[PDB]
Amino acid sequence: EAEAHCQAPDHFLFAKLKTQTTASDFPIGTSLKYECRPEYYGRPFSITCLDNLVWSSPKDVCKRKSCKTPPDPVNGMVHVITDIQVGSRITYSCTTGHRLIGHSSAECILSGNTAHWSTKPPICQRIP
Description:
The chain is mainly β. 0% of the residues lie in helices and 35% in strands. It contains no helices and 13 strands. The protein has strands at residues 5-6, 15-17, 26-27, 31-36, 40-41, 45-48, 63-64, 76-80, 89-94, 98-99, 105-110, 115-117, 125-126. Strand 8 (76-80) and strand 9 form a beta hairpin. 17% of the residues are buried.
């Protein structure tokens, strides 16, 4: 006996399947393992086939990697345009009077194991 089956799990994209599988229709009562992508963090979760031919509703389990906010530079401050994930770039701007020394806008990225800004935070110094 095994009436009803949970249809093929929807594509997460940010998670690659990680469990023995050789069929389209999955049997209810079975968690499928999925590991997020490098640019993501939240350990390997799993969607449980409940009964209504549906997979357990996953909350905020998977989340794109994010770099730690850079310390505000002396006589200045960085403004995030949206956020600080491995894709969003933060703009640096010193308070009126002193010009920034170093770069202009560092983009948050990822090497593979750990996320880090493409360029270290500049500085600020009175303009000659």
